[PDB]
Amino acid sequence: AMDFTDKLIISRPLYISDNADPKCGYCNGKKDSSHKFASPGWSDFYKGDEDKVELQSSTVGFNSELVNAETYDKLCNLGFRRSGSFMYKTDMLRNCCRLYTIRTNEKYLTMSKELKTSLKRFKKKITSPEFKPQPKYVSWIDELCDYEPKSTSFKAVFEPAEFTDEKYDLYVRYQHYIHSDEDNTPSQFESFLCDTPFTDSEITGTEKEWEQLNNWHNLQPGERVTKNGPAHECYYHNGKLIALSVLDFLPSGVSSVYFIWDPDYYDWSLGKVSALRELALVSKIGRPYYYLGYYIDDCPKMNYKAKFGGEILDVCNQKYVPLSKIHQIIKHNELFVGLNSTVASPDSEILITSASDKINFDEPFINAVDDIYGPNGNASQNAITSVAKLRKYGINYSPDLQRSIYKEIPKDVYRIPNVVPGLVPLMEIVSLFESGKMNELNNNVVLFDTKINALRIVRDFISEKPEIKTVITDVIRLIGLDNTKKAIIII
Ligand SMILES: [Zn+2]
Numbered sequence: 001a002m003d004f005t006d007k008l009i010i011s012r013p014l015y016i017s018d019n020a021d022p023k024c025g026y027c028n029g030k031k032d033s034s035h036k037f038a039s040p041g042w043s044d045f046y047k048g049d050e051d052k053v054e055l056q057s058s059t060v061g062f063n064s065e066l067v068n069a070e071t072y073d074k075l076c077n078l079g080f081r082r083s084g085s086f087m088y089k090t091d092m093l094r095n096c097c098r099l100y101t102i103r104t105n106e107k108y109l110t111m112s113k114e115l116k117t118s119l120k121r122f123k124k125k126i127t128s129p130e131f132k133p134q135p136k137y138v139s140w141i142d143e144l145c146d147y148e149p150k151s152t153s154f155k156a157v158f159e160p161a162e163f164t165d166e167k168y169d170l171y172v173r174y175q176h177y178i179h180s181d182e183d184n185t186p187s188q189f190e191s192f193l194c195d196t197p198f199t200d201s202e203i204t205g206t207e208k209e210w211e212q213l214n215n216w217h218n219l220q221p222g223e224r225v226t227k228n229g230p231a232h233e234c235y236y237h238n239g240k241l242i243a244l245s246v247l248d249f250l251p252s253g254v255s256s257v258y259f260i261w262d263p264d265y266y267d268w269s270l271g272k273v274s275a276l277r278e279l280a281l282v283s284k285i286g287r288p289y290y291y292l293g294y295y296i297d298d299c300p301k302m303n304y305k306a307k308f309g310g311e312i313l314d315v316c317n318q319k320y321v322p323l324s325k326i327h328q329i330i331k332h333n334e335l336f337v338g339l340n341s342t343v344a345s346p347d348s349e350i351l352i353t354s355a356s357d358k359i360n361f362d363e364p365f366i367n368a369v370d371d372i373y374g375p376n377g378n379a380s381q382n383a384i385t386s387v388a389k390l391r392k393y394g395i396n397y398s399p400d401l402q403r404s405i406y407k408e409i410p411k412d413v414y415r416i417p418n419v420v421p422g423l424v425p426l427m428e429i430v431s432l433f434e435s436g437k438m439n440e441l442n443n444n445v446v447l448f449d450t451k452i453n454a455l456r457i458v459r460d461f462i463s464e465k466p467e468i469k470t471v472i473t474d475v476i477r478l479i480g481l482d483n484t485k486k487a488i489i490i491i
Contacts, residue, residue, distance in 0.1 A: 041374030061088030069228035104310025202229025253289035315422030386426035
């Protein structure tokens with residue numbers, strides 16, 4: 001009698017770290033000393049010795065077999081992104097590049113000369129001279145929603161996120177045009193952009209639901225669309241597929257997964273046009289945010305997302321700050337951890353589950369990164385003490401006793417570092433245990449116990465084997481206690 005449409009079905013978490021040269025495709029392991037470290041305190045720790053540090057690229061995450069749109073919305077707002085069915089994030093303390101989750105909307109959008117030009121050229125490419133413009137347009141959104149549906153040469157169509165040979169061929173051509181002529185197999189395209197982990201209703205939908213979404217240009221204020229889940233938006237120019245947008249519809253807005261286009265159409269600036277159309281779509285369907293993925297201030301292929309404005313997730317506070325308020329202090333690849341300036345100096349990682357006095361980015365605030373996560377910050381020692389306290393509950397963690405977070409020139413993939421920004425701090429995990437809150441897992445969390453090859457509801461968490469309790473605790477670190485209560489964890 002299990003309701004699988006209310007479940008997050010996941011594999012045990014993985015922590016994957018290796019040299020950023022060559023594993024990081026954003027920086028290739030090449031940074032100036034001024035951008036190399038996560039904070040000024042770590043820069044100072046390595047002053048004159050920056051060459052002894054080998055930058056690593058590190059992610060943490062879990063494979064999903066089943067997720068619904070509301071849960072994926074929560075995961076995006078925790079800082080995760082899906083790569084096919086794999087939900088991941090970087091370790092922002094240790095990673096070579098500082099990746100921030102960004103979201104925006106037409107409110108934050110400040111239409112620049114460049115962007116206006118891309119729309120003006122798009123209108124001209126697709127509009128017949130017979131087109132008669134309306135006397136006035138309140139905004140560029142109403143203008144686009146007038147001329148685009150009247151074009152006879154250009155049509156965009158939303159449909160299920162399913163593989164076709166014609167989409168794959170377009171993918172291969174786009175990937176070759178950016179740097180990828182290898183690792184371009186049909187299977188890789190299918191897993192990355194098709195074959196999603198969502199519920200069957202969210203993938204297939206209904207004929208009416210797709211019809212409704214495909215008339216989005218004519219939605220009136222206050223109307224909505226029922227669509228949630230993954231979609232493809234196919235761009236056709238005289239019947240030829242010239243671009244493909246892969247999009248996830250969430251209760252809070254639309255997430256761009258990827259966008260490919262026919263290299264012959266370089267003159268159409270389809271990257272910009274598609275982003276603006278998706279900003280218009282978000283506005284027309286009455287949802288609040290457009291998610292472009294990760295923002296990296298020092299990477300041009302990722303910092304273009306700032307042209308569309310918006311706010312950045314501070315994963316330690318679980319709150320967004322406008323990018324304009326912090327751009328000046330993240331422009332050397334720093335980690336930002338917000339602290340209202342009126343708040344005492346922090347002797348610990350910020351509490352994520354016991355989050356009463358949430359930061360207010362409207363009041364004055366500072367970057368507390370070095371007080372918490374610097375070389376003389378409190379996080380590491382608090383986490384070592386917490387590892388020892390968690391032993392009595394049968395949690396098989398080991399203390400991270402190295403002096404530095406960075407690898408120096410003189411691997412268990414199930415071992416997460418004690419200290420990772422945005423994961424529940426180990427000191428808070430101790431609090432959950434001491435207060436009895438971990439027993440809220442009982443009668444809630446489900447295991448797919450691969451020995452029995454059967455589902456079972458956890459009834460007495462503390463009497464489970466330590467291997468199991470450790471895995472569950474790492475899922476809690478990643479997604480929090482309340483989301484874990486709706487998980488099925490494969491072990
Ligand atoms: Zn990097």
